[PDB]
Amino acid sequence: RSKEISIEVEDIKDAGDTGKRLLKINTPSGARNIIIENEDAKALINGETTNTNKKN
Amino acid sequence: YPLAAWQVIAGSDIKVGDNLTTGKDGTAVPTDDPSTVFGYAVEEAQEGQLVTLVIS
Helix, strand or coil: CCCCCCCCHHHCCCCCHHHHHHHHCCCHHHHHHHHCCCHHHHHHHCCCCCHHHHHC | CCCCEEEEEECCCECCCCEEEECHHHCEEECCCCCCCCEEECCCECCCCEEEEEEC
């Protein structure tokens, strides 16, 4: 009868929507895409800014 | 012959109702960490004594 019963993210009944997205994410870039909504701030944190991002 | 209970040598002091897991050298020891639990004692045993446990 198995040994571990590896649950999945959606089995965690009091996890939040952003919380489940973060738990599923594999890389730091993916996490930043979830967490940072302001596109100019995200661009700064990614070290990749256009002239429009810089002005903003 | 699917047994509901086993007779296993105790690796340490086991009390009645204690959840058991593997210890060193195949002996049975008390545990407080679910997933390591394979059964529980219905008998009390010192150390090196056999203890009856119900598998769960």
